[PDB]
Short mmCIF file of C-alpha atoms in Angstrom, two decimals:
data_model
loop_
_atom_site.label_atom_id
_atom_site.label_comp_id
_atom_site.label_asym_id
_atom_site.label_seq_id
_atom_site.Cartn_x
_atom_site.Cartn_y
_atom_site.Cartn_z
CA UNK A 1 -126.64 26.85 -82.64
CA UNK A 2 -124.07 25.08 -84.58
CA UNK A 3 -125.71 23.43 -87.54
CA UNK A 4 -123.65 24.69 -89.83
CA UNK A 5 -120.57 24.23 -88.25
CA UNK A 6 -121.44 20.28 -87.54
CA UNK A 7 -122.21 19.87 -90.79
CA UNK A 8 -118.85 21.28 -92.46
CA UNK A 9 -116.65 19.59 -89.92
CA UNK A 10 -118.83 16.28 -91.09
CA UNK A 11 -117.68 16.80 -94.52
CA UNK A 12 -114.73 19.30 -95.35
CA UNK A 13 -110.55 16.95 -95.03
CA UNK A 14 -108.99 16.84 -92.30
CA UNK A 15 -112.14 17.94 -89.91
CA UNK A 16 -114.49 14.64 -91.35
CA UNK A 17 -111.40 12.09 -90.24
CA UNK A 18 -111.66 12.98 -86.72
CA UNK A 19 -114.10 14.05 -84.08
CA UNK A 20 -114.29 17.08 -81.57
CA UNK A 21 -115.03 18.18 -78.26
CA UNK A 22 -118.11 19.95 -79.61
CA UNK A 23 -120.32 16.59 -80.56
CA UNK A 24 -119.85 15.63 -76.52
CA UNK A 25 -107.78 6.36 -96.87
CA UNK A 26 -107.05 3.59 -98.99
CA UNK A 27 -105.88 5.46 -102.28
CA UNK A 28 -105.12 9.08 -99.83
CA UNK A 29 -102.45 6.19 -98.25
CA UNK A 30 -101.20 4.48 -101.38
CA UNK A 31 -100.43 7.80 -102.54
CA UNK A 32 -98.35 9.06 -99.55
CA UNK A 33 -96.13 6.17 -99.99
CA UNK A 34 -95.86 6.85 -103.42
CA UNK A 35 -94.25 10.10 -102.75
CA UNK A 36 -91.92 8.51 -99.74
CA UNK A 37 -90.85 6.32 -102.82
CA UNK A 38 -89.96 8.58 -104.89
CA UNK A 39 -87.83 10.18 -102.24
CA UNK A 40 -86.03 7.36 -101.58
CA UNK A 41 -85.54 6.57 -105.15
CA UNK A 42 -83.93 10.18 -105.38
CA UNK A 43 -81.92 9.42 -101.96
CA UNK A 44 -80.28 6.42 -103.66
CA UNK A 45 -79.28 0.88 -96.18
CA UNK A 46 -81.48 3.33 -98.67
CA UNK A 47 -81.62 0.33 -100.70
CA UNK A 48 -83.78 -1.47 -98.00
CA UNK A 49 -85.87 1.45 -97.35
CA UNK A 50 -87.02 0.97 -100.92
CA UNK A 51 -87.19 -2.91 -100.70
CA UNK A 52 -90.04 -2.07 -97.06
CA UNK A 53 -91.93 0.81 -98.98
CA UNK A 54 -92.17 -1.67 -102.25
CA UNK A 55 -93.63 -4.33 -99.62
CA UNK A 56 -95.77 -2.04 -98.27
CA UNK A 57 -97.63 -1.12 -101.45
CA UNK A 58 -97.19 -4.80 -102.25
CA UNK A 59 -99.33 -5.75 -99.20
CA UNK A 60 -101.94 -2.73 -99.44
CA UNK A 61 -103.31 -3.78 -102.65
CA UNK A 62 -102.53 -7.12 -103.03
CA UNK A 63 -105.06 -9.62 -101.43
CA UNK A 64 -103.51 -12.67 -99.64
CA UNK A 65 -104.26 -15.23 -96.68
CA UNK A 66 -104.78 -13.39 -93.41
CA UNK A 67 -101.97 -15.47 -92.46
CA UNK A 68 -99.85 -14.10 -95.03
CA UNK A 69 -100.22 -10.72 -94.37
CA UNK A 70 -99.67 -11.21 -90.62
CA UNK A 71 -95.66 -12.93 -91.24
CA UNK A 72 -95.19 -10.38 -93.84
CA UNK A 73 -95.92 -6.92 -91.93
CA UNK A 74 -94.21 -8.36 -88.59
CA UNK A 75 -91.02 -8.74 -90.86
CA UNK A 76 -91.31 -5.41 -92.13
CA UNK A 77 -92.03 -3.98 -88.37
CA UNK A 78 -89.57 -6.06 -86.98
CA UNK A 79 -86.21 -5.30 -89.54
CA UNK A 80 -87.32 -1.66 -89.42
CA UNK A 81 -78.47 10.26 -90.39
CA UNK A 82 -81.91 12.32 -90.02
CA UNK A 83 -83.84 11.87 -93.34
CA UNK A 84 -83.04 8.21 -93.15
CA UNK A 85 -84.55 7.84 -89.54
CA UNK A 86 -87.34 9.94 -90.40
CA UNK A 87 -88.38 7.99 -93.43
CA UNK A 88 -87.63 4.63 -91.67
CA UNK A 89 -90.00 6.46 -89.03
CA UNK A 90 -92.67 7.07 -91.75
CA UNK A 91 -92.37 3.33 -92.85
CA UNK A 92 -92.94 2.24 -89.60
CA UNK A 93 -96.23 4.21 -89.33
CA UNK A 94 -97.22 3.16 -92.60
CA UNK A 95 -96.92 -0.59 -91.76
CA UNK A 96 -99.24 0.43 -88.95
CA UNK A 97 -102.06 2.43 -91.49
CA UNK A 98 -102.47 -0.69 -93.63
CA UNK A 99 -102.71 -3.36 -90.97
CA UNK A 100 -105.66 -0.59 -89.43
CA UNK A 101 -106.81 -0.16 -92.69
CA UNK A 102 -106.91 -4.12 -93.16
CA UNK A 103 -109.05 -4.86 -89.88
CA UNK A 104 -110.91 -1.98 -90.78
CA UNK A 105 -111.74 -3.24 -95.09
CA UNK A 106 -112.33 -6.70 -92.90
CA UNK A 107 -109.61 -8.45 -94.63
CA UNK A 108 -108.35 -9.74 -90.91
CA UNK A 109 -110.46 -10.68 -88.22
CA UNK A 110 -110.29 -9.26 -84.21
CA UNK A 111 -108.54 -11.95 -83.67
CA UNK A 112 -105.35 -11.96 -86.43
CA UNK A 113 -105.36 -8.10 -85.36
CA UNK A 114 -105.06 -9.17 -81.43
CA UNK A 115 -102.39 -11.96 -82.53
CA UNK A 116 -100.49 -9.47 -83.99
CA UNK A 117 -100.99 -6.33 -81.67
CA UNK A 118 -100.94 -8.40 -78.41
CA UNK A 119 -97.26 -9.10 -78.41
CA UNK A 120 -95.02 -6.95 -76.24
CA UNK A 121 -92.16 -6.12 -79.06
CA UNK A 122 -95.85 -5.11 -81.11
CA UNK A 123 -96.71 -2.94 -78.22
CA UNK A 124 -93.49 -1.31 -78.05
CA UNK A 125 -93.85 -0.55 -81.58
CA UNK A 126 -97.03 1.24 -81.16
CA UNK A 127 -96.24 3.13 -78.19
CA UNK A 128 -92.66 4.48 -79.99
CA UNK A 129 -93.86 5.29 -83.61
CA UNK A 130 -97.24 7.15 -82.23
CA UNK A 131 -95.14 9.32 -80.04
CA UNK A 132 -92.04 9.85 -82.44
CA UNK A 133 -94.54 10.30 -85.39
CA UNK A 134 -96.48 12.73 -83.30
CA UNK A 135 -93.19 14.73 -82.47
CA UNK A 136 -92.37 14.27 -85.88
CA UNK A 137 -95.48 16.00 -87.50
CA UNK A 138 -96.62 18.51 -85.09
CA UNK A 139 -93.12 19.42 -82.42
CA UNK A 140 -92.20 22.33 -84.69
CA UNK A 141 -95.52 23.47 -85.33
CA UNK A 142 -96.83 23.24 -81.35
CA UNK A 143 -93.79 24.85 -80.35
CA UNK A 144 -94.42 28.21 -82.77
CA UNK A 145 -97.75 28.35 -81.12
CA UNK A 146 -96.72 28.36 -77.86
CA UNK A 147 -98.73 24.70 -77.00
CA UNK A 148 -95.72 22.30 -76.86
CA UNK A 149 -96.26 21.97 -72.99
CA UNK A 150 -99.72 20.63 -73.69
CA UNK A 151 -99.27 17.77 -75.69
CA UNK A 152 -100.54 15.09 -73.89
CA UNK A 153 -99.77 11.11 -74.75
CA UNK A 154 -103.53 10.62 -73.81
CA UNK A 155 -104.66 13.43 -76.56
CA UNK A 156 -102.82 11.82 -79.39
CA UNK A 157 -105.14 9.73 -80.93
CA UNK A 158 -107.38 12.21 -81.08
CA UNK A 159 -105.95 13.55 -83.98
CA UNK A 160 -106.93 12.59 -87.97
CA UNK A 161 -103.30 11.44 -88.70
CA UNK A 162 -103.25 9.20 -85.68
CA UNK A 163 -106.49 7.26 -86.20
CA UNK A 164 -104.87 4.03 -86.68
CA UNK A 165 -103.59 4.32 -82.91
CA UNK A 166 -107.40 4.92 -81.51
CA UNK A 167 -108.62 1.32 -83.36
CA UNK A 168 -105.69 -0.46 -81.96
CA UNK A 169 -105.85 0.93 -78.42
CA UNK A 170 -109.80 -0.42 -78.41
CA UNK A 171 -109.35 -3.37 -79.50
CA UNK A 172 -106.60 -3.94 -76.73
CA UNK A 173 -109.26 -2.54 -73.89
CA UNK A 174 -112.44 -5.15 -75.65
CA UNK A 175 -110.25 -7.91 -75.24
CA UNK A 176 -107.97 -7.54 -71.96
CA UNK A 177 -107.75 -4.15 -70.76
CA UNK A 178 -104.56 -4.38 -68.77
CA UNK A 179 -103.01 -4.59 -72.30
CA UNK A 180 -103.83 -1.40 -73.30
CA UNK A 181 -102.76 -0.12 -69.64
CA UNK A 182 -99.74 -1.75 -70.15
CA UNK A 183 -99.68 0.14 -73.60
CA UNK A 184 -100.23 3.21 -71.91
CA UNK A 185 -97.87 3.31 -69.34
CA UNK A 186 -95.37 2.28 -72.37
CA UNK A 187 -96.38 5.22 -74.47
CA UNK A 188 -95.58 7.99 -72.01
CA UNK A 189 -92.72 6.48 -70.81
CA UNK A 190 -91.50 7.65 -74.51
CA UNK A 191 -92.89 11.48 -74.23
CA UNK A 192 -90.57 11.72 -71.32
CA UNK A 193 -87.52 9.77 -73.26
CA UNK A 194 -88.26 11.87 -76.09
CA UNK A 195 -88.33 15.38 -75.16
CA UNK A 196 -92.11 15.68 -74.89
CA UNK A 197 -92.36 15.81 -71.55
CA UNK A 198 -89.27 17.60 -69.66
CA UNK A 199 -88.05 17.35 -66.63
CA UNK A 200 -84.61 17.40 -64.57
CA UNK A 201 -85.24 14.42 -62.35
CA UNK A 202 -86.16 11.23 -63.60
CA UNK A 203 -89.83 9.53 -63.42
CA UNK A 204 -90.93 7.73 -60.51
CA UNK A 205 -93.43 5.91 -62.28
CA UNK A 206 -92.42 4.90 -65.94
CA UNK A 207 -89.34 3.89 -68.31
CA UNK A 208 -88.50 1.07 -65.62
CA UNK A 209 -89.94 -2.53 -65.63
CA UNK A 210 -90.05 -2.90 -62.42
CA UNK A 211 -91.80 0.76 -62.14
CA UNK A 212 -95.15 -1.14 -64.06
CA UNK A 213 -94.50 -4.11 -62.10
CA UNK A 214 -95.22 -1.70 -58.93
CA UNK A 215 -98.36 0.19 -60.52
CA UNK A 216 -99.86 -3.35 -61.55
CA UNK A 217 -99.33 -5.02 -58.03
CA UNK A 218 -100.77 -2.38 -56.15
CA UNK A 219 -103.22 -2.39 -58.88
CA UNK A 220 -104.17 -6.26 -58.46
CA UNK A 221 -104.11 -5.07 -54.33
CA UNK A 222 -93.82 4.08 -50.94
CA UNK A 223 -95.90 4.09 -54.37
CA UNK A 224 -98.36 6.27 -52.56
CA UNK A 225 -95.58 8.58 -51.10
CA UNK A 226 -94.60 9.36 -54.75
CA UNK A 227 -98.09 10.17 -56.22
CA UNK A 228 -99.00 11.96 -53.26
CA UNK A 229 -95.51 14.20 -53.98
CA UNK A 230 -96.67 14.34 -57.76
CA UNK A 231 -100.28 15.43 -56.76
CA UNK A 232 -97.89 18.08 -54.36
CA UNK A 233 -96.47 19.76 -57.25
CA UNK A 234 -99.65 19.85 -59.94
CA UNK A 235 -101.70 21.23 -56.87
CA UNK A 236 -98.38 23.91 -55.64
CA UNK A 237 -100.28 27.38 -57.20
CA UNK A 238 -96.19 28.45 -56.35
CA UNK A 239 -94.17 26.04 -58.37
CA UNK A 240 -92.52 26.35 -61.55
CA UNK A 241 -95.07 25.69 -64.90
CA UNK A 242 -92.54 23.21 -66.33
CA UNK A 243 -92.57 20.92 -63.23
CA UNK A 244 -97.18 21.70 -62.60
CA UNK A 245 -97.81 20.38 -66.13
CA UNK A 246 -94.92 17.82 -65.86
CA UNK A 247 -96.78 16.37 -62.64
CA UNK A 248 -100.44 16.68 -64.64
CA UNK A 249 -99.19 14.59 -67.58
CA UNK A 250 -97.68 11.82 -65.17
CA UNK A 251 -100.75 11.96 -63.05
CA UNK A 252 -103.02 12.04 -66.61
CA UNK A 253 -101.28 9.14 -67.49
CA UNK A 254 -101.77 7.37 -64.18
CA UNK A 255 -105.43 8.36 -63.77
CA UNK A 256 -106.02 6.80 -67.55
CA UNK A 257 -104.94 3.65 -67.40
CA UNK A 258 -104.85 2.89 -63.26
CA UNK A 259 -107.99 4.26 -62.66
CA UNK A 260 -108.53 5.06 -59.00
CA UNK A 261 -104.26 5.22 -58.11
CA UNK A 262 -104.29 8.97 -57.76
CA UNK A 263 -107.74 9.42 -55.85
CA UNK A 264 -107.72 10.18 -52.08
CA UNK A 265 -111.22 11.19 -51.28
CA UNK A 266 -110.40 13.10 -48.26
CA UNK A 267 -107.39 15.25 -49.48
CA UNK A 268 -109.24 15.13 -52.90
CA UNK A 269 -112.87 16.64 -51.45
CA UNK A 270 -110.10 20.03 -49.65
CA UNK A 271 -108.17 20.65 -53.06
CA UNK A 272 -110.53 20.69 -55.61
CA UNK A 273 -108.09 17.95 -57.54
CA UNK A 274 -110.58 16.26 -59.63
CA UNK A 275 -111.97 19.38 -60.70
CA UNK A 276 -108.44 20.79 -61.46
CA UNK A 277 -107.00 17.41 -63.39
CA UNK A 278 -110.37 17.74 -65.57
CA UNK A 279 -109.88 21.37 -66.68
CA UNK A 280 -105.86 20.65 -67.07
CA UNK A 281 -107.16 17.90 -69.52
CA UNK A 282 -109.41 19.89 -71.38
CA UNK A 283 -107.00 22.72 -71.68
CA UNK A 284 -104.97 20.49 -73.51
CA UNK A 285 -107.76 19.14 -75.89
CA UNK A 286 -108.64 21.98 -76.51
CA UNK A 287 -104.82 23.46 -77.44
CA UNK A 288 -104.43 19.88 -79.85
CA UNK A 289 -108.05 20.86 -81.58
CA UNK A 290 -106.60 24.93 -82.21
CA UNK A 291 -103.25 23.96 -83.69
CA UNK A 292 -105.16 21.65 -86.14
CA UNK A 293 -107.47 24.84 -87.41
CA UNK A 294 -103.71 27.17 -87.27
CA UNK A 295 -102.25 24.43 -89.67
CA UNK A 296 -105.03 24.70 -91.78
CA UNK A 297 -105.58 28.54 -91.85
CA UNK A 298 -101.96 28.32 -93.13
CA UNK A 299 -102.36 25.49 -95.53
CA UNK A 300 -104.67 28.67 -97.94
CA UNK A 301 -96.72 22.12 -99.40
CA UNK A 302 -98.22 20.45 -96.32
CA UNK A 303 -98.42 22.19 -92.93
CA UNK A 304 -99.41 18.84 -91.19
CA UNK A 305 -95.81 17.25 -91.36
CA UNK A 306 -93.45 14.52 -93.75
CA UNK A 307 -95.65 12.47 -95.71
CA UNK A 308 -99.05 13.67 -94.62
CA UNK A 309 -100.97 15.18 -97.55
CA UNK A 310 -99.80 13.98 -100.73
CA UNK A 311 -100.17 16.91 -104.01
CA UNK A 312 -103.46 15.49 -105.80
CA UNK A 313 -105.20 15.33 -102.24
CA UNK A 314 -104.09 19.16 -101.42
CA UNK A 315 -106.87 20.87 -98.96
CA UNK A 316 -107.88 24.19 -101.66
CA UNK A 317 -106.13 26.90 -101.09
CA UNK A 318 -109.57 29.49 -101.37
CA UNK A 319 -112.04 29.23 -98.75
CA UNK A 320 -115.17 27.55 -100.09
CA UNK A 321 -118.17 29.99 -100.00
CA UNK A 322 -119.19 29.72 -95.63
CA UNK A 323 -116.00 28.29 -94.39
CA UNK A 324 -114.50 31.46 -92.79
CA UNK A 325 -117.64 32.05 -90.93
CA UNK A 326 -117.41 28.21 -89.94
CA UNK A 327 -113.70 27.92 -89.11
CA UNK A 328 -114.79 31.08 -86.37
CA UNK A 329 -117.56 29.16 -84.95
CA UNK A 330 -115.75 26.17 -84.81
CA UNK A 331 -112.66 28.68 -82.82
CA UNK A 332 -115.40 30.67 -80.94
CA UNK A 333 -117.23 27.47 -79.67
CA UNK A 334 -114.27 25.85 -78.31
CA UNK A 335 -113.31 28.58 -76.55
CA UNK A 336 -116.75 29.39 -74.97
CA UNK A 337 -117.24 25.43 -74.45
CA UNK A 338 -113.35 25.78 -72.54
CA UNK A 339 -114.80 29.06 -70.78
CA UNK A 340 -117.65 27.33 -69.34
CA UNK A 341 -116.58 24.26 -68.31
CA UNK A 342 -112.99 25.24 -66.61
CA UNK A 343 -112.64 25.85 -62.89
CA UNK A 344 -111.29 29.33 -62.66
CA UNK A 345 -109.54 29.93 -59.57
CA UNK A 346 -105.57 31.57 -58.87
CA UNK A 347 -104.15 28.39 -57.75
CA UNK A 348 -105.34 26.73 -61.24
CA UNK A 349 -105.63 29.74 -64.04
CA UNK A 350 -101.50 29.09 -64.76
CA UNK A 351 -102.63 25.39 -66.30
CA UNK A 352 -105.88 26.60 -68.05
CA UNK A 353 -107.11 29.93 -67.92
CA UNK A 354 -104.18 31.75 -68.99
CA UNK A 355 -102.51 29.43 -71.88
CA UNK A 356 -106.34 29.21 -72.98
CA UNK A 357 -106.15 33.08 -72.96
CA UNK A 358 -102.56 33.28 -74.97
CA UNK A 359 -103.73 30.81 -77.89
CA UNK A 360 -107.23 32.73 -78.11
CA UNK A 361 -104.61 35.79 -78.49
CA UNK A 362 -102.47 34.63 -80.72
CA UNK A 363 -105.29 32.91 -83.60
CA UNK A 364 -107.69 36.15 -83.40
CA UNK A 365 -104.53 38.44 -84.00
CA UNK A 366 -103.78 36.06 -87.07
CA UNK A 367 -107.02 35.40 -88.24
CA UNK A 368 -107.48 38.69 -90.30
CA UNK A 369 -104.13 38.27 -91.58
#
């Protein structure tokens, strides 16, 4: 029974901003950029960063025309060393948090949100700033905890930073869902660019134009030669990790927003792939959900990355009377939930079974601590 732990995730930040695999802003915003401004102000090229993060809190709380607000963030979106591209970064994601946070306080409609988002230099936007944001906030801390290899594009959203990115994505699939396959294919072509996704040889199937262009004819129907080769690798119990969860991300991605491209129902029925793919994909969900409870166990400055929990909005540093005994059911559910539900067999446990087994390892062993 899990009462108790539904009901603290419903109400204790970050847990109440996001949902889990165990159900199946305004003013926290305005002060973020706040304390981005008073970087730059200390920094002080700065001089425009100030000039976009001035227009940004100009736009939050002032009320115009729909109209308005739409010419206004585009220019910001579209004139946008390492501090300076990781605040012009953080600008770029906060133009993207107030024109959710606008569709969302219904001060523009579906359809000034689809005029905006619908554009392919829009699109590119999204796609970049989710993954670089994502890479930005949670590389370092993935990588301590051993989960790096399991960040998947498609898991992303998932997350309470990256809500904005969820509401943007649906609205593309309501209102012509090869947009948001289009997005798709976009936004892992950047974990690959971007040192999310390694590998020695280059993709097969994104970063190239005419790569989508390929994927959508056959879509609107030597493509099949190189998922068949990717499926080959994922399904090889004998090849390297790096190049199994290489071929699972590609093949994720392909699955998610091609549906059907990587099924072949008689090879499929003789390796068990659907099976496999789903417990490779919950391995990962559940990997995203267990650094989000490590960052907070270490949060009693932010552990959640630049610019994500301003001072006055702090999460306590003492556990409030219950939440240890909640934060373990919440870690001893998922695991039991991942237990159940994984295929556990020698040509798979590399993908699932044993990273599950290393991160159950490594939070237990740090959880008295």
């Amino acid at each position: 029974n899990s009462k108790d732990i539904r009901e603290y995730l419903a109400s204790t930040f970050p847990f109440e901003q996001q949902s889990t695999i165990l159900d199946s802003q305004l003013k926290f915003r305005q002060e973020n950029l706040a304390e981005l401004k008073d970087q730059i102000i200390l920094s002080l090229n700065w001089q425009k960063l100030l000039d976009y993060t001035n227009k940004l809190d100009e736009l939050s709380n002032t009320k115009i025309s729909p109209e308005e607000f739409i010419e206004e963030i585009q220019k910001v979106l579209y004139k946008v060393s390492k501090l300076y591209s990781q605040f012009n970064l953080s600008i770029q994601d906060f133009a993207l948090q107030i024109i959710h946070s606008k569709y969302k306080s219904n001060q523009i409609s579906q359809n000034d949100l689809l005029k905006l988002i619908t554009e392919d230099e829009m699109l590119k936007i999204l796609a970049k700033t989710k993954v670089l944001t994502y890479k930005m906030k949670y590389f370092d801390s993935a990588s301590k905890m051993g989960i790096n290899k399991y960040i998947s594009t498609e898991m992303m959203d998932l997350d309470w930073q990256f809500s904005h990115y969820k509401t943007f994505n649906d609205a593309l699939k309501k209102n012509k869902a090869s947009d948001s396959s289009y997005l798709g294919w976009l936004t892992h072509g950047y974990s690959i660019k971007y040192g999310l996704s390694p590998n020695n040889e280059r993709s097969m199937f994104f970063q190239d134009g005419r790569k989508y262009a390929e994927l959508y004819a056959f879509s609107k129907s030597d493509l099949l030669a190189k998922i068949n080769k990717s499926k080959g690798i994922f399904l090889d119990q004998n090849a390297l990790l790096d190049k199994r969860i290489y071929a699972f991300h590609e093949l994720n991605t392909l699955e998610t927003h091609f549906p059907g491209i990587t099924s072949s129902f008689t090879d499929d029925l003789k390796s068990n792939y659907r099976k496999k793919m789903e417990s490779v994909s919950l391995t990962c969900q559940v990997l995203q959900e267990i650094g989000n409870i490590h960052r907070f166990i270490e949060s009693k400055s932010t552990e959640y990355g630049l610019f994500s929990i301003p001072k006055i909005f702090s999460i306590p540093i003492d556990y409030k009377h219950g939440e240890k005994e909640n934060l373990v059911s919440y870690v001893d559910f998922l695991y039991s939930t991942a237990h159940e539900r994984i295929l556990q067999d020698n040509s798979i446990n590399q993908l699932c079974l044993d990273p599950l087994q290393e991160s159950l390892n490594r939070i237990k062993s740090n959880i008295p601590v």
